[PDB]
Design a protein around this ligand. Structure first.
Ligand SMILES: [Cl-]
Ligand SMILES: [Cl-]
Ligand SMILES: [Cl-]
Ligand SMILES: [Cl-]
Ligand SMILES: [Cl-]
Ligand SMILES: [Cl-]
Lengths: 160, 160
């Protein structure tokens, strides 16, 4: 209606924009818990809906990266334990979740299979060492077949 | 200056907000390559700077999650190969990077150590099997000590 009304409309659009600016900034640096308020007026509702969606997306996305950060430490800790021979240590999948949690069990399961082969070897070789030669090393696939043939090799030497 | 000027200021603030809205939305769904333009006017520059920062943050953050997605498949593939005894397979760290890349080498290194113990066992046990008993299983720490004592056990039986 007047020159003052125009100036005022602009001063308001400018501060509404400044608030959205402060908000996006508070996202750029982890402040993703404190919810955004409601839109200043009809024209900014869709915009504000997206801000909320964004905050939500950034929040979850940060949790997952945090996960992968816990995964690396756990793997590193397990690696250290195993180099010292403490092979019963595993990555704690219990406090992880989603993708990270699955990778952790994957690692524990992969090693468990390798350890299981050794458990069996330490076993029959222990029986071979203390007399009895009845036990036979399990048959293994691919390249692990060498373990089974090598154990058979010393199985004859003894038995005959 | 006039009632029309006020209405016009509002129609403009409304479309500027609508553009920012479309932009945040194009972020909500992967369109993070096409750069945002320049701000419509002085009052929206800080806001637009943050949009660019956000797009950049969302872009990198997506790359890392993509990484962890490639890590899980690689681990799964290696796990499958190893269950079939193809123990020379590893997770391809070469096409990964950052955190994911380190986790991959960690896994390959952890297993390599376990495999190395078996290589040594298959070795001296092979020599024990084909006559000569001079070789001695390496001394192992923690719980892997059983392997070394078990191999010693069958080392005497033969030698005497
Ligand atoms: Cl006036
Ligand atoms: Cl809210
Ligand atoms: Cl409005
Ligand atoms: Cl008028
Ligand atoms: Cl740009
Ligand atoms: Cl302005």
């Amino acid at each position: 209606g007047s020159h003052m009304g125009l100036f005022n409309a602009h001063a308001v659009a400018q501060q509404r924009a400044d608030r959205i600016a402060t908000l996006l900034q508070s996202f750029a640096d982890g402040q993703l818990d404190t919810a955004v308020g409601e839109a200043p007026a009809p024209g900014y509702e869709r915009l504000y809906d997206s801000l909320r969606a964004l905050q939500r997306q950034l929040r979850e996305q940060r949790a997952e990266l945090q996960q992968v950060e816990s995964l690396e430490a756990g793997l590193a800790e397990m690696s250290r334990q195993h180099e010292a021979g403490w092979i019963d240590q595993t990555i704690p999948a219990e406090r992880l979740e989603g993708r990270a949690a699955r990778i952790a069990k994957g690692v524990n399961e992969l090693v468990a299979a390798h350890i299981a082969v050794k458990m069996k070897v330490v076993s029959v070789v222990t029986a071979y060492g203390q007399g009895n030669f009845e036990p036979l090393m399990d048959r293994l696939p691919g390249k692990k077949a060498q373990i089974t043939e090598a154990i058979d090799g010393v199985r004859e030497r003894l038995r005959g």
